[PDB]
RNA sequence: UUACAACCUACUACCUCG
DNA sequence: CGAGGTAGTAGGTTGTAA
């Protein structure tokens, strides 16, 4: 876009500050000196050295060497001092966090405002609070390459908090049983979470899944400020008015979170922070400047709009579209000419009592909903170019009220049905809502997923509330169910475009899952790996991981890359002088040492005959940056609407430069924004590891964008590139399956090698 | 567990450097 | 093993399907 406005302001800083520097090779002394010199000096440890900035005349003295520190060369000093000085600039706002300074609005409280707007009241409602929370993050950025500056970035959220005495909630007739409670006050490094409520007898809450002690005094504990606890309290207290409160609260928040309202709030924060000089030290001021923009003015080259992603439906490119569903329904799937299994046999496993409902869903899915539900008129068979689909019906004698034996019944019925039947190529498993979230030792989702994956049969499962959706929602659910089921059968629904530049490119991602059976039990880490290859004008999904242990994960990345390089070379028969590029994706940066051994081992495997280029990229969701497109009017929220959605939301594929290694990428355009009250979106942050030998982060941001469009879980694009997302879905599944009796990964790389079984 | 999206809370980690 | 900058991951509730 021409000009993208950020949520940050320039901070005009002195061009240098004098400081006193002392060697301190042991960081553990810092906390003793910081305290010792409180109020008189700001101190900061960097690079084995203690840096001391005099904030005011007279107090303990410091020894060391005098140095002048030039802000252009070492912005880290004054960046850290700003964290404290912003706090000091706002003495009437109490820090609820430091670094970044985070604080509450003085008066605004939205429960009260929503209650008033809805016409509601209840004696305990003043004890439920939703309060705007602002943070001010000083960040280093580079308008133009080689030149640094510090800006202050403004972000807004809401603190949800339930102040109510547990005694008063019990006495007003809310059932506290099972609610998570936290300490009212926390000490330094003390935990918040205490456990769940078993009972309140006497002056004390009895807890289970406790973290430390098994009981705690009513007055030391509060319900955690979760949506679960708000809904459970307020629905009980307000009954059939609860809906009115909710819709009105949604309106209040929109007043802080939509584009023009966010923009206006950042404006007002800036004007407040600007009104005075912000003082860094006794005789040293900083000054909050203009809003930071991302533009191509005056030899800055800080923004671009990537072209639209093309959804690709053949090996050439004749058949492309801007949207997955419109492409698919028009051309059929990318692999239609070669797809091997025109007559899939699909086992359908379901509670016997849901038979008529399951038959209706199956008819809709297979044969279509017809021409009044135009999102899913024609059905899976014609959609995908198949000859037919045979269902093998597997009813299970199981009740929704059965909490302990549901998994056993599903599995027995599967075994018994399969033993007679011939080959089945996939299954659909239909699940009761009350079974969906049972613990894994008795969960029918995971037990049936396990048994059928062991047998080499991918499944697409579904809950009964989904089976029963009204037809206008059901059409969109059948789109997504269809896309994943076809992919489960080895199909390639679509690919995404790329330009033929170098002689081969491999992208590998890694994803984490952190699993436990409850919130009070320590999570265990598992990983997945997903690979994607450049093909002939479009990107192709490779093989995925079958092992999921987190320990050794850098070696597993290295092993995946070196094995695939070796096989890519044999296949493509690279010529002397060809260039091969390897890109890695994750939600965190790799270690420098691991980058070194990966590069070493990939370079040794490829050999001296080819050039290799390697990039290591972090994709970040939660950071302090927001992009505002003031040109964007937004769209009508539905047909004929004075309300707008995605007002000020940058276009999808907008790429802004933060610094040499970092870009912001806008993914959620007005079209994709859900409703009028949906907030201004945040972009993803794309960061290139400094040790990368391939350096074009613009190219890597556009590539990440394309990979969000490659998901076969949905017609709509994913939140993060499939290299990472598929890996998280694999890690979660494989880490759960680890503990399920009789699970074996043996078929994962045999019957299921081309099955997208993890979608 | 059709999904996409938003939010909230809780939990802690990750990388760097010495 | 700690300073320092940073933000990841899980699970719940509600609205909507480029
Ligand atoms: Mg799925």
Residue numbers in the entry: 19 to 777
Report text from the authors:
Argonaute-family proteins have crucial roles in gene regulation in collaboration with small guide strands, which recognize complementary sequences in the target. Argonaute proteins belong to the PIWI protein superfamily, and contain a PIWI (P element-induced wimpy testis) domain, a MID (middle) domain, a PAZ (Piwi–Argonaute–Zwille) domain and an N-terminal domain. The Argonaute protein of R. sphaeroides lacks slicer activity and thus permits the formation of Argonaute complexes containing the guide strand and the uncleaved target strand. Our biochemical analysis shows that RsAgo specifically interacts with RNA and DNA as the guide and target strands, respectively, suggesting that RsAgo has a key role in a unique silencing system, that is, RNA-guided DNA silencing.
On the basis of the results of the nucleic acid recognition assay, we crystallized RsAgo complexed with a hybrid duplex containing a 5′P 18-base guide RNA strand and an 18-base complementary DNA target strand, and solved the structure at 2 Å resolution using the single-wavelength anomalous dispersion method with SeMet-labelled proteins. RsAgo was composed of N-terminal, PAZ, MID and PIWI domains, and L1 and L2 linkers. The fully solved heteroduplex is bound within a positively charged channel between N–PAZ-containing and MID–PIWI-containing lobes by an extensive hydrogen-bonding network. Surprisingly, the 3′-region of the guide RNA strand was base-paired with the 5′-region of the target DNA strand; this behaviour has not been reported previously for other Argonaute complexes. In the MID domain, the 5′-phosphate of the guide RNA strand forms hydrogen bonds with the side chains of Y463, K467, Q478, K506 and the main chains of Q479. The aromatic residue Y463 stacked against the 5′-terminal uracil and the main chain of A454 formed a hydrogen bond with N3 of the uracil. The present RNA-guided RsAgo structure showed that a magnesium ion was coordinated by the first and third phosphates of the guide RNA strand and by the carboxyl group of L777. The PAZ domain of RsAgo (R204, R209, G210, L211, E242 and G243) mainly interacted with the middle region (nucleotides 8, 9, 11 and 12) of the guide RNA strand in the heteroduplex. However, the PAZ domain of RsAgo lacks the second subdomain, and therefore does not possess the PAZ pocket. On this surface, the target DNA strand (nucleotides 14′–16′) formed hydrogen bonds with the side chains of K49, R52, H62 and R97, and the main chain of W63.
